[model samples]
Target: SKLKPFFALVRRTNPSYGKLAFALALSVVTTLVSLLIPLLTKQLVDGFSMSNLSGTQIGLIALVFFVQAGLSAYATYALNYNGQKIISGLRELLWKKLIKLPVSYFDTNASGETVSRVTNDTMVVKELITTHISGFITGIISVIGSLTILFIMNWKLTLLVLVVVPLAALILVPIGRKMFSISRETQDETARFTGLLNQILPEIRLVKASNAEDVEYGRGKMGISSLFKLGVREAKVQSLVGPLISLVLMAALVAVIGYGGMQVSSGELTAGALVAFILYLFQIIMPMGQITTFFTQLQKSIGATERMIEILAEEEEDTVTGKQIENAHLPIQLDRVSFGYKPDQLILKEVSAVIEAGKVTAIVGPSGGGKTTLFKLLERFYSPTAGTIRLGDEPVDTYSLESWREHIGYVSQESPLMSGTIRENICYGLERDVTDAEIEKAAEMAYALNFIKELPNQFDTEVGERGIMLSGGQRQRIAIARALLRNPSILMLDAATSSLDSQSEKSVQQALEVLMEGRTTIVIAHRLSTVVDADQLLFVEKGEITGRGTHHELMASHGLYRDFAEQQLKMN
Candidate 1:
């Protein structure tokens, strides 16, 4: 709303003013040289014969024209260079901010809309900086230079022309304010449409399988239709202003010709001076157009600046400030941890439990009973709304976030993978270059070697988007291979086998056992059989820990656990 955000953004981009100054300086030279053309025209008109006009004078006009055009081109290139550097700095700064933003920020904001801020939004600011703003500056020089010449030659006519210029301002300034509010809406709608496409395209299979194409078609078309209407609405505003300025300027031109003609017929004003006066009118009028365009572009750039400022000021997780985990094998203690995604409702409440060092701790509960929420807390995706989770003497928050996550290996039901070669997917997070043998060893430990070896490209095979090319079980093993390569000190599995068939689950379960050795493990399972052998079992019910003991102890003490064990789980 205020200019404060735009000023801050300009400062943040670390703009160098030297190029801009050079561009403007060159622009001033061009404009001043151009003013010479109208003055030269006055001299040529007064002479009115070949005998009076020498070749040297005629040639001087040609030289001035060429030099002005040449210098303008050079000025434009320097201005463009300045814009590119500034936008590049802004884009890089935003990219860094997006990567470090806390998980809670992504929870509410769409990935595509956020991406738009870095791409499309920065583009608007660049236009303002490179083309519009520079043109605007040069335009002011052109107008001022023309007006000064006119005033010196005939002050009365120059004053009459100044009256027309303010009339153009009267039309532009109020309508320019209207464009800012419209421009902001158009930008937000663009981001929303981007968000919609990002959400739908990835899950196109679901849309087709559910026969929801018609439903989605209507929704997509609505966005498209609304954008079309907004475009027309904006055009209507533009349509009025440009022509209105021209109409006022044209009437002023006719009045100038009539007044200058009367003066000339009475032998008061010279014919050459009247000719120069008309040329100067054109110089002033054309620059008014560029200045008006600059206003429109400036408004859009301000809106873009506001969005970037909002994102850059977000509360980021400090990944480098805290201590590294010296001993992850220490028992992780939860002392009445409570959390909620919304203020009115809690997903987990007053839940206290201690997970033993280097032992498997299975977190088992009914569906929507806070099992996954517990894993998110352990990963520090969020800080708890209440209570503390400590590892030995220090709270979990004391550990450096990046170090904490680096020590953790998490494989969920989806087993998500990026679009890359199988080899790249396995070595995704490793900063160091891995040897073939090291990669092979990790894949072998995860029981993924056989499948990868049989693929046409072997380890170089593309996983497709989200590993869609690989089978679900193969994706799980690939993720396991990824986790194994990291050699994590703490392992968390959230219903890892729940998405696979029994045959694939057996392979995955075996692979998990190999990966789970000696590490402190936490597994959230729907099938209690997967975790029956775990050293400890914590039964979470309706955001509360109802029972804590071995599986056998919970079966005897907790009625819901006994009922769940009978209906959904088979003991081995």
Candidate 2:
């Protein structure tokens, strides 16, 4: 079934079936009550005098009217409540899946488009449920009940009316076929616009700094123009359906009136019966439109379901599937580990090395030489295409990602921090909550407390967006403080202190030294101060290790490393 995904999603959400049944039942009650109106009107008009109406008869019509209004209002509220619950559950499931998705997924799909999937696509299904479903079911009932009444009133004329009514399908079918493709195209363009805004709005500074407003503006206009053209195309299809549908129904109406008149002149039918038959014809016609709208909306919702299920079905990172990490204190062996973002273009080609336990090994290379890619592979962000990394006898992938990552502390150059208080940023992902004293102790070791204590709120100070409110050095200290709290066994420092000013460099460098003291640490060496202290150094160039030995010997082995080391010490 094409709709299996939709049913599958609904099943997972565990909606309140009792509430759904209550809402639909109330809808039926109101429809049945409203259907009584034309019958009462039939009796009133047949008497040919308003004064001939009994008080009880008048009271019964008014009673039915009020009951219908009240039940309809309550039913609408119940339906909306059910719809909200479904959407909430949907968003919850989507958010959980997205956070656990593989890093490669984000590389292939736009983050903004993925965001639109969670926020925008779910609403299409909600609208179909809350607005269309019950209306469709009740509309069918209204049509069926009115047809039964019309047949009882005069079977011959009812049969004549049924023949005329099939003409509506002739008008509607051709127009509806053109509509489905147009509406779906409109939905796709809307998602494109959403992706554009999401990508641009957060990086407005980049657009301004690079003088890229014109380029971005052109992109925005292109998407907007496409949507406008699609919107008008949809309206043209709709415009055809409206008048053409009215033409068919009106012709049916006129034919029914003419045939009823012939029966009346022959004394086969009365004026009041003709009036009631006309009322029943309207009852059937209006609901036919409702039924059309129901199927149209369902078509759109099915499309949304397919889009959502695509994301939900994507492969997630194996965070919980493997065994827990052990033998973490043993050396990690990179046995001819190789990888590339694209298989044809190897970023790190057949590289193998040993990271000794409880020691620092520095990786030095020119920019774009796959140093960060190496770190990513070590952290298991991407698996090696041709080889394996292992701790003792166990492969890295054999251990659960959640467990393997717990012992790994990474502090990169950017030193990204979440938007929160200083204290919260330092304790961001600790499995258990830390005491303020423990947090302060870690901050003190990182030398973060030195600046934090100078602030108005101190540990409670807000970091702002991506720590934009704090200096780069300040963010680095916070990251170190976070790592200190983790007390990880393996530390990765990729240009950790390279971006700081002299004053910040001295302190953050000390923080890095403290964090790396007892851990198996990997450094992307860019400075003489850091390179000189490493126990071993690997000189990487163009995805291959060109030199290996102690820092001094590697400088001796390769003229390139010697010149790079010479430049670093010159700056020192």
Candidate 3:
């Protein structure tokens, strides 16, 4: 079970043994306060039986009750204060782990499952820390203290109670195990539903275009039904234990009353002592009941821990390395790389390419010919399964991940943007302070300054997600301007102008002309017009570059590249 990792995590994350010990102290004080009530009741009963009890003695007993009440009230507040802080700290740590863990962690698990662990599973940690944990402590102390006092008062009756407790303890092994099993399944189903919703909603545009509403609806409904069934199963298991324990408790109560009644009548035990003993017996059982509940919750928390640790265990990008590529002369090279996501499914087979210094290279291929995979490889988003990729002369694996990325800039076809001021959008990854003057220079450099200044807030303007509020041309221009601010040596544009209108496309093209200067630029192009004037256009088919020359040369010499150019020209 992934749960085994949690014990180490808790101990490592929360090493403040002093705080836990303080919480234990409050729990012990709470149990002691509870014991005082039965002792006070015993004293009052004895005084009344003598018919000589004084008002002052009764008042003193009342004072003890008041002090005990105050002690319990203070302990409750203190315990909650300490426990809530601990839970908050642990939650912060879990969130930090989520951000630091590798992208592969997310690749292996559904988005919904990750969200559930961060949100729902953490809530279970709160339950285990706050009420359930405090109750367990109190229960242990009460059971132990009450049992000791009971035996001292009358061993015969204590012996009667002792026999049944082991029987009740034995029942927890089976009933508790069943509860844990059901709880784990219920949480897993909930995570599946969460991941499903996240995936569908973000791609709603694609879903609606494909007329997949019915399919998605059925999937969502199926998830809900499965979750409902799991919930019901868990509820049944959790509900059984309480009643079964109560029934046994009831049986023990009757036996104690019947056997103790004869002792009181025969004067073998005092009536006051018998009454006090009965109260103590119930006190012991209350904590036992609480322990049972704590164990039940531990089962659920363990399930959540398993999910969270799975992510925490993933490979992490090195943070200690500075964001500066140390080697100056390393040009990007992909050396005989072979890769596939699954066995016997090669997407790129023995592919080798060299991206030289100070040149513009355009890659043209049909869809799914592994163009984007090349970009991902250069970015180190995925390491190749075989062969090697190098930056200049240094193996890409040798450069710190952040240092390698600092030297490159990328722009995708969709022109994705965050909802922030125009300045933030323009200089998203820049570390040095970007002045208004520098920002204006970059915007003009990308040919985006003309329209940007006309916006209501200009460079300070906020754009919505993916730049949805802007026209296709405006979004693409801003994306180019943003990449330019990075001042990178290597620039990659993946179908940067694939969706633009003629006017927008021209504006984007002019900006690309400026940005491509003095840099190693790789443009993945589908339209021949975009690559016809390139320094070199490589025609790719089945992950291999079959033709490399000017676009006109390829059109005349290569059949596949020429077919693509002819079809694209006819379609438009």
Going through the candidates in the order shown, the clash numbers are 0, 0, 5
**Top-TM-score structure, candidate number:** 1
User: Which residue runs of candidate 2 sit more than 4 Å off their true CA positions?
Assistant: 48-52, 100-110, 154-268, 315-327, 341-348, 365-369, 384-386, 395-400, 433-436, 465-467, 525-529, 556-572
lDDT scores in order = 0.75, 0.75, 0.70
Clashing pairs in 3: 112-195, 139-287, 330-392, 330-393, 331-392
lDDT of 2: 0.75
Which of candidates 1 and 2 is the stronger one according to TM-score? 1
Candidate 1: global Cα-lDDT? 0.75
Tens digits of per-residue lDDT for model 3 on 1-572?
Answer: 65557666566566546766676686677578778788888878877745446465688778877887776677677666766776677678777777665565255547766777778877787677667878887887787778778777786654466556567668757876877777788878888889989988999999999988898899889988888888887777778877877786677667767667767788886577888877886777656778889888887988877766675776666645334466443455667778745437878787777666666777766666676666566556665678677664543455567665666677776756667777777767766555446777666656777766676876557676555666656666677777777755767767577656777777677667766776677777666566754677676667765665666655665755666565676588
Tens digits of per-residue lDDT for model 1, 351-445: 89877888887776666667667766767777666778878576465668776777777677685677777777777767554544677766665
Instruction: Give each model a TM-score.
Output: 0.77, 0.76, 0.72
Worst 10 residues of 1 by lDDT: 563-572
Which 10-residue span in candidate 3 carries the lowest summed lDDT? 321-330
Superior candidate under TM-score, 1 versus 3:
1
Q: What is candidate 2's lDDT per residue for 256-372, written digit by digit as tens?
A: 788778777778865677777777777777787789899888888898899888878777556655785655788877788777677877676778887688878887766566766
